[model samples]
Target: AAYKVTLVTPTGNVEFQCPDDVYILDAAEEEGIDLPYSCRAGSCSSCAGKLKTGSLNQDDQSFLDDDQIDEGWVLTCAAYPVSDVTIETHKKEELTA
Candidate 1:
């Protein structure tokens, strides 16, 4: 199934439809929304974002620790939406802090 993904970024908010089988970052890219990211392999924090609502499946990401993950931080490059979700993007500083 597809889910609504809302991204709150520094530039502005962007909304897109994302399939459960696709990563959030990939979905956004398909929609022509340029989001911050690097090392699309899920081993980096360049695509970090804060989950504001809903949940996602992001087991592929290995950059965040348990505490960060528990705190709602996610790597968009590896996150797959399980439900409609809202995320604060461009959160590398906060994620690394």
Candidate 2:
């Protein structure tokens, strides 16, 4: 199903539409939204974000610990939105600086 996804960043909120089959970061990139990332797989945390609202599937992302995943932390590159979602894409450095 097609769903609306919003990435909340320090600069502003960037929103886009994507299907449930596609990865969140891939959909964002397809819409010309530049999202931070390194490894496209589940091995890295560059595309990490906090799910503020809505639901997603992260069965493919085994890199994150139970605590992080439980706390709504998700790897955008490995996450698929099962429904409309709002995610904060702020890195820790952005919050401190």
Candidate 3:
């Protein structure tokens, strides 16, 4: 199913529709939203975001530790929304903070 994804970025909030099979980052980019990301393979934390609501499957991500994941940090490049999700983008710093 397709899910409504909301990204809360520093510039503003951007919304997009993401199919369960598509990555949130990819879906956002397809919609013309320029979100921060690097290493699309999910090994980099550059695409990190704080999950504010709903849930996603990001088993492809290898950058964030268990603690970080437990804290709601997610790698958007590797995340597939299981339901409508809201995420705060540009929050890579919070992972190391």
Cα lDDT of candidate 3 equals 0.90
Candidate 1 local lDDT, residue 86: 98
Per-residue error at 34 for model 1, in Å? 0.6
lDDT of 3 by residue, 1-97 (tens): 8999989999998888899999998899899999888788999989989999998898999888889888899999999999999999998776783
Which regions of candidate 1 deviate over 4 angstroms?
A: none
Best by lDDT: 1
Which residue pairs in candidate 2 collide?
none
Per-residue CA lDDT of candidate 2, range 1-97, in tens?
Answer: 8999988987889888999999998998898888888878887777888899999999898677888777878888999999999999846343210
TM-score of 2: 0.90
Residue clash pairs of candidate 3: none
> 4-96, model 1: which lDDT tens digit per residue?
999998989989899999999989999999998879999998989999999899889887888988999899999999999999999888765
lDDT leaderboard ranking? 1, 3, 2
Top candidate, metric TM-score: 1
- Per-candidate Cα lDDT values, in order, are 0.91, 0.84, 0.90
Give per-residue lDDT, candidate 2, residue 10: 78
